[PDB]
Design a protein around this ligand. Structure first.
Ligand SMILES: Cc1cc(NS(=O)(=O)c2cc(Cl)c(Cl)cc2Cl)no1
Ligand SMILES: Cc1cc(NS(=O)(=O)c2cc(Cl)c(Cl)cc2Cl)no1
Length: 559
């Protein structure tokens, strides 16, 4: 069937849309080529609609069925709990889209009678009506990028807030626990950046002759078929579940997940969806299961040897045993045809890699540096282009989500995050005296409230003390960074070193947590380094839950 059907009504915006980076003294200090940074808007919607609209091809074989049974057998060991309205309400982001039924996210979090009453009626409707399609709003997503030698906006589809709260009640525990139980070490969201690096490295070193490849599926969500969504549900149904939960999952699958009507911001019928909606609770879990299922079966079909997979939603990386140069290439080609038959056609043609560092997965790659003792240490890094473009943007325009805080946390050990992100943002937080003001950011799709002054401990817990002493980065990494800066008009690293010294000093002067930031975060700036010892409060942080599952588009907030 067609992934989408359009009536012709436009995908409209529900407010003005900013698309250019403002000329701002603060952002200009970070990146000068402001015309190279842009944000996607609804104006490019019709271009994305054209790319995601096509008839799907799907042929299932024995390998597929064998893998499905193996997964369901593992899903059988799970017992998921039904969440109370209260718990589900507490999981709602303070700035989540307001309902069209007289209440907003604040009301849901406060458990106001109106919100809670409407939520119950939605739940009860789910238990009674097993077929009426549920409404969804389709919007053009606003994302920031750097021009290329442009990207059309992504399309986000989501149901009303009442429904989103009901999804949590029935499936929050499921999508938070089942992936791991079914996929084991192959489930990516269970790892922190350091654990992910450890898994990829260990997996690589375990092969007699490693060969790896990332596999980019062409617009994954639109490739998910009705059969994929029912197969996915047949997996969830193996969990021990409360009666109402089992029914809510059954109704939600047929009324929301397999597809439904699309309505624009103006209230006009835009068309219909018969594929994965990006904004429902099961998108991340469902995509990871679907991708893992097809890929695992595809490997057997292609005769790839000892396939180890790491999956995060639609992002897939595979590490296996080489059978020779020509053999690997032929087998990779058969792998791709197998996925295509499963309705997971390729975007960028996959290529076999024999150098672990040359493999990009989840937009990142493993690289190497050295700690104080001179010992080698693997860490996760990426092309800083997008992070830098977004940092500039978030500096000139106040944004709800601060990707820079999240990039600092996730890429703390990198050359660019240390010399540029930490320096730029701490310098600004000092100038405006807002070092103690908590900010919102996202980790694996989940929204978190974080205080900048807690970065030292957080970084220590997630990456270890070595994140504050890495030096002697690799030539390729250093060159990718420098090259990136020249392209975007970002002052050269030498300049950032100089700015860092001034920042560090100011931080120490203030003492307290502020001084701790100067000591650990900017120890790389001074030539006469300090002895960095374990931070007290670090071994006490409750980082339980930060890396459990993916919640992209799941409207999740963790307090
Ligand atoms: C920050 C940030 C990004 C994020 N989610 S994500 O961009 O999908 C992501 C980031 C990283 Cl680093 C890895 Cl290894 C894997 C994933 Cl899937 N969560 O926090
Ligand atoms: C972090 C960090 C900084 C550092 N040394 S540094 O002198 O600041 C530095 C490193 C590199 Cl690689 C470049 Cl191109 C330029 C500079 Cl000025 N080592 O790790």
């Amino acid at each position: 069937s067609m992934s989408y059907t359009w009536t012709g009504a436009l995908i409209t915006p529900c407010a003005a849309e900013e698309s250019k980076l403002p000329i701002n003294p603060l952002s200009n200090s970070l990146l000068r080529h402001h015309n190279m940074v842009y944000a996607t808007t609804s104006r490019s919607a019709s271009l994305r609609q054209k790319k995601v609209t096509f008839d799907r091809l799907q042929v299932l074989d024995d390998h597929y069925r064998d893998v499905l049974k193996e997964m369901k057998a593992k899903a059988s060991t799970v017992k998921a709990k039904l969440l109370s309205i209260e718990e589900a309400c507490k999981l709602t982001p303070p700035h989540s889209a307001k309902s069209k039924f007289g209440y907003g996210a604040k009301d849901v979090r406060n458990l106001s009678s109106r919100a809670v009453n409407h939520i119950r009626s939605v739940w009860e409707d789910l238990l009674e009506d097993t077929e009426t399609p549920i409404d969804t709003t389709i919007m053009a997503k606003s994302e920031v990028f750097c021009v290329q030698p442009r990207k059309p906006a992504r399309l986000i589809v989501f149901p009303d807030l009442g429904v989103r709260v009901c999804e949590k009640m029935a499936l929050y525990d499921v999508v938070s626990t089942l992936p791991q139980a079914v996929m084991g070490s192959s489930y990516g969201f269970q790892y922190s950046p350091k654990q992910r690096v450890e898994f990829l490295v260990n997996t690589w070193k375990s092969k007699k002759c490693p060969m790896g490849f990332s596999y980019d599926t062409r617009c994954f969500d639109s490739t998910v078929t009705e059969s994929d969504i029912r197969v996915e549900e047949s997996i969830y149904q193996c969990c021990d579940l409360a009666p109402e939960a089992r029914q809510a999952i059954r109704s939600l699958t047929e009324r929301l997940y397999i597809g439904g009507p699309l309505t624009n911001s103006k209230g006009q019928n835009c068309g219909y969806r018969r594929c994965r909606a990006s904004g429902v609770l099961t998108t991340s879990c469902g995509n990871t299961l679907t991708c893992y299922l097809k890929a695992t079966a595809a490997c057997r079909a292609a005769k790839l040897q000892d396939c180890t997979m790491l999956v995060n939603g639609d992002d897939l990386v595979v590490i296996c045993e080489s059978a020779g140069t020509q053999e690997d290439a032929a087998a990779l080609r058969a792998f791709t045809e197998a996925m295509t038959r499963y309705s997971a056609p390729p975007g960028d043609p996959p290529q076999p890699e024999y150098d672990l560092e040359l493999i990009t997965s989840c937009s990142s790659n493993v690289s190497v540096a050295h700690d104080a003792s001179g010992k080698r240490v693997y860490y996760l890094t990426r092309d800083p282009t997008t992070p830098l473009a977004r940092a500039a943007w978030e500096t000139a325009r106040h944004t709800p989500i601060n990707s820079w805080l999240g990039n600092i946390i996730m890429y703390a050990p990198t050359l660019w995050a240390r010399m540029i992100l930490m320096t730029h943002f701490f310098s600004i937080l000092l100038a405006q005296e807002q070092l103690e003001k908590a900010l919102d950011c996202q980790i694996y799709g989940a929204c978190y409230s974080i205080e900048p002054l807690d970065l030292p401990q957080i970084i220590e817990r997630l990456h270890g003390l070595s994140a504050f002493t890495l030096h002697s980065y690799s030539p390729g990494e250093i060159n990718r960074v420098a090259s990136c800066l020249r392209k975007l008009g970002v002052p050269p690293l030498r300049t950032w070193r100089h700015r860092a010294r001034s920042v560090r000093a100011k931080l120490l002067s203030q003492g307290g947590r502020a001084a701790t930031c100067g000591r650990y975060l900017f120890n790389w700036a001074v030539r006469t380094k300090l002895k960095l010892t374990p931070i007290p409060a670090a071994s006490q942080l409750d980082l339980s839950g930060w890396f459990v599952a993916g919640y992209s588009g799941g409207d999740i907030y963790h307090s």
